[PDB]
Amino acid sequence: MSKRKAPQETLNGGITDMLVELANFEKNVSQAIHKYNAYRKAASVIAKYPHKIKSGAEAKKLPGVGTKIAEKIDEFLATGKLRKLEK
């Protein structure tokens, strides 16, 4: 908790963070469910990934992420279409 100085609104991706979080549920998600392992396998191909996408095409390329987990990958990456101040 509190290592040096984390951003206030995260950077952009945040894929392996919200994916590993669902597996860390330790309450609503048991420790051996099918949907439970859906975020663990997808989190292995996402966290290794650059874990930062503007759309949901990168998750489709990952064979691990796509079986009902790709929807969550867009939940965090859905508000990543903000403008960057033109001119």
From Swiss-Prot:
N6-acetyllysine (modified residue): where?
72
Localization: Nucleus; Cytoplasm
Listed binding positions for Na(+) 1 are 60, 62, 65
Using the record for this protein, list the coiled-coil segments as residue ranges, or answer none.
none
Q: Which residues carry this modification: Omega-N-methylarginine?
A: 83
Q: Cross-link (Glycyl lysine isopeptide (Lys-Gly) (interchain with G-Cter in ubiquitin)) at which positions?
A: 41, 61, 81
UniProt: K(+) 1 binding residues: 60, 62, 65
Q: Of which family is this protein a member?
A: Belongs to the DNA polymerase type-X family.
Q: What is known of its domains?
A: Residues 239-252 form a flexible loop which appears to affect the polymerase fidelity.
Summarizing the function annotation, the protein's role is: Repair polymerase that plays a key role in base-excision repair. During this process, the damaged base is excised by specific DNA glycosylases, the DNA backbone is nicked at the abasic site by an apurinic/apyrimidic (AP) endonuclease, and POLB removes 5'-deoxyribose-phosphate from the preincised AP site acting as a 5'-deoxyribose-phosphate lyase (5'-dRP lyase); through its DNA polymerase activity, it adds one nucleotide to the 3' end of the arising single-nucleotide gap.
Q: How does it assemble?
A: Monomer. Binds single-stranded DNA (ssDNA). Interacts with APEX1, LIG1, LIG3, FEN1, PCNA and XRCC1. Interacts with HUWE1/ARF-BP1, STUB1/CHIP and USP47. Interacts with FAM168A.
The identity of this protein, by name, is DNA polymerase beta
Q: Which residues of the full protein are shown?
A: 2 to 87 of 335
